[PDB]
Amino acid sequence: KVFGRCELAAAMKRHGLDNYRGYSLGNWVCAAKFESNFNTQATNRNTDGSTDYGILQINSRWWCNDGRTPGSRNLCNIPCSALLSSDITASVNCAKKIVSDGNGMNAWVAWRNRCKGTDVQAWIRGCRL
């Protein structure tokens, strides 16, 4: 599923992401835009052989099991395919584990490079929330 911007913002809000560990909703929407262009089916392979899955591009080296990333962990305890669902619950629940891991949203390279220190509230302007 390809979300609309406000539709995703609402979904994320309902799933407890607004201000989760102090990151306002616009942060999460901004990270999704640049990670996946709001497409839950997004996948991208990394140089190390791991793959990033879903709306927030969660990596198989640490967070999910895809059966093809040797020596990897599965810290969210989920098949990576669950991250591709039109239902974002598994992605959100795993993202909450990731953002709590030490480095905050800096874990998402696109957040650090394209969202951090920008007017992220712009991503939810106009939405009914």
Active site residues: 35, 52
Q: Is 60 in the site for Na ion (CB under 5 A)?
A: yes
The interface mask with Na ion, positions 65-104, x = CB under 5 A, is x---x--x-x------------------------------
| 8-state DSSP, 112 | I
Annotated binding-site residue? 66? no
Which residues are annotated binding-site positions for substrate?
Answer: 101
Which residues are annotated binding-site positions?
Answer: 101
Binding site for Na ion (CB under 5 A): 60, 65, 69, 72, 74
